[PDB]
């Protein structure tokens, strides 16, 4: 069992990291809204949207039960962006960049929680 504050404590630092990202964690930061930002199909590709903001609200709201489903939702944030976007476009190349960073600081983190 994890108690949501030994989750927040553990996890935060492994978000804040992504957060820190510029450039690439800007087009990562708020909720997608398709029509807004001119890309009217989106939800149609993408099923289910993860953003850096949601992830964060999450983790101070206490809805993960088990750090597996954190690390799911990062990666489901990548994979969004890998599925949308062309290769050559900022955000495929950012979302790259954030999966490097992410590898790096998630795993001596999910070591530490078990
Ligand atoms: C589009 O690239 C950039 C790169 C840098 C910056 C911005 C936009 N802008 C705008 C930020 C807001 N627009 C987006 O978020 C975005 C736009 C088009 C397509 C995608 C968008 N992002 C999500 C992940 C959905 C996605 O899969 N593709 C801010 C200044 C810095």
Known sequence: IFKPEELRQALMPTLEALYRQDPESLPFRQPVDP???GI???FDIVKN???LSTIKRKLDTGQYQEPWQYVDD???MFNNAWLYNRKTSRVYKFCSKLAEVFEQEID???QSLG
Do not use: E, H
């Open 40 to 42: 009217p199909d989106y």
């Open 35 to 37: 029509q807004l930002l």
């Open 74 to 76: 990062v990666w489901l």
């Open 108 to 110: 001596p983190v999910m």
């Open 49 to 51: 949207p993860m953003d």
